[PDB]
Structure 1
């Protein structure tokens, strides 16, 4: 009775509502993609009957199709009725094609029922020739299909369009599956893209730079990836089932129906996706520097976009000059170290935001910081020569490497978070110091080339800048010490010249020698202490054999290391006069401030 009707329903069971396609390889090592609708096709009832006679087999078939309809109706409640219509038709076709030996779906009950139905038809006709049986089944379908279809939709004719009640034309399964898949695809494609619009709006307010927009963008991307592999399978199976030919332009026509040329063009992300899903203060510029205008045009690579710059969380290097910092918390573990002003003002952006641990986001952020650092440096020192600009870019490049590797001496608020957020990218559950270090170290090696590529884009004749890799391998402090030398010698030269132009001006007309001399005394004493600190570390560290594997350093007096590595000091000897409260040439002049 009605109770027994429930039995039919539950024999097959409630259907999953989501529309998905599952790809597996069959016994012949051949990959196929089956729709979940086919996986859940209502066939269980065949297994609950002895199928004693052909009348019975017919009766059970009638129950199967009619039940499939009910379950499809419950599945598609709340969905556009066109969907229920198509699934009715497509399931009817699978009943036909899985019955007459044209089925890509395999395993589980699909083969359990198939094999059973074949065995019963062996009994019915007493024929074991599989080919003959298949023909017998084809004839049987011919005579029963009209009644099977009619009964399948008898309770739902009113819920579908008049035209959907017409029995489906007979076609190969793969043709029907491709069509169904195409429809499933375009629907989910629209939906996922509308979410992108909703959350990204027009992406004119850096929406794509935040999770609200990046999530639907990301969902859309993966869906296209999965979809592309799926269509490849289905499209190859078509050719294979037609002597390796696109019989009747089926595949071709289908591509033109959607205004596309082929698989590739079918999944090529349009301009609109990039416009809505690329964070314009990271992704857009990265693409320019690696693949676009900036790549081969220094002028363009050098031009700064203020809005993007401040969006990312950095600003121009101030015209003011910060002192060297020899008194941070880092002096606890590394006494004698002096942080370069350049390091104190290094652009890292909002590193505290990469807490979700996505490698692509992290890479995108690092390259962003690297680009702006380069541009900002280029802007600050645009009036310097190629060799200097080159070395200045390498300084920050190497510091970045030290920050990512976790060897950076400063461990400031933003550096630390950069390091820790790379640890987050690492999903390995072994999380001791050395284990995490090794990961970061390997990660930098895999990315350090691109980092240099984008930073080197702001230099004339990029290949002029060499051994950036070797330079990065040099202990940070040693790199800084030399940086300090060049900075010291330079500013000393400047201050000497300042005295001259001042002396010559006074030498003619009107004349505070004491006041300028005073300012210099303060400066030189400050630099003297900085020098002493770093010399002490260089010496103490050297004695601990920390520089054994470093040529052009082993057993070289600190002040010698400077005169060599520091070009700017080539003409200076670190005497005991060098740090005099006044230059030896202006010693007497700074004295006798009576004139």
Structure 2
């Protein structure tokens, strides 16, 4: 069982270090001490080799318990990586006098004040010695890396000091968390299939509650583990005076798979942007021109997608680079989309939200306004009209990565601005595909609608007109905006009339009526300007 309280009491130094659940049971063959006064130099070298020899015998039988290859390799690397840190470190650990007494005996026996450094060579006199001993035996006893007429793994280079402990700590938490995720997926996997009642779900609900309490205990001490970790990175000691998930909430909270039966009754993430290091046309303030009666989408007319036919063969030869190139295409947006819009928070945030939904629509493979892009996509993948779950989830993870990338850039721009915008993605962007059609149509109505009444004050209604022809023209040329808005309303009526022709009323005409669809779609009085 988890001996956290017992470990804290026995350790007595108040550092929240908890061993994994598997690191409490071992073959009870080690004795506190063997011979009392039988002391000889080379013999106790063999004794620590015997310890290494003992380290060759627990994991030999323990390997058969976890027959999984990935789990076996993880456990074996952890076993042969943890123990060498204490012996190789030659520093203070959670041990009373075991290394201290032997080092005392070493400096007392060999020579005075001139053998400690050579004692370090003792480790390199025996760290490689243990590896060569196992090479003599056959490979049947222990599976290794498959080689021609040979089965061994390459020697692992010793990590630098202060880096080994975090690697041992890091691999420990990952294995435990993946084991418990495997347990939570194994238990209560299917609930909606004849399990809507609370009878059979009780055990898995209790398991989820226990796991949540686990995460609550694990969240608190990690910062304390980070607390001593931050204070132990002292550099330049000689001084005058001593001195995939989104955030941590994913770790504390449970995975969304339990959300179905859950119905009510320091900056390393941004550094990847550095790792992805290594065009403007002014299409937002342009003058709208009528051409063939079809409005040109400003968001889609200047799509940043240029496919080079010279590297089509590399799409079949080395796709793996091109995938990163696809990520580099996202990098184009993080060097193009952010700078183009402006500085106003709300308009810019809705701007790139609409840009991302438009590019996702373009890469949904359902709209066929472009021929070359559709043909190239069919050649590369041969997708279907709308049956692309993998492509949809791919766009979803690109959207999540681009949103996480935008957060660091906007946050880094200012130093004291308040984060009014939500760090995570609101559910409003998760609306269905005809809902995002409705969003695109609705976003162009009440903005300039509200702007229209603002222009009334700026007009010259106070000044009067008399004597036939007007005396001023600057206050009368602005009246063409009403006719332009009427033309926009007419083209929106034409497009919506065309919208009915898409389905043709074969089946599933509409989820609900449009008069209530427009008003109930908004949340907490958000449709005030929409057809008011």
TM-score, L = length of structure 2: 0.38
Structure showing greater Rg: 1
TM-score, L = length of structure 1: 0.34
If each structure's helix is expressed as a fraction of its own residues, which one has the higher value? 1
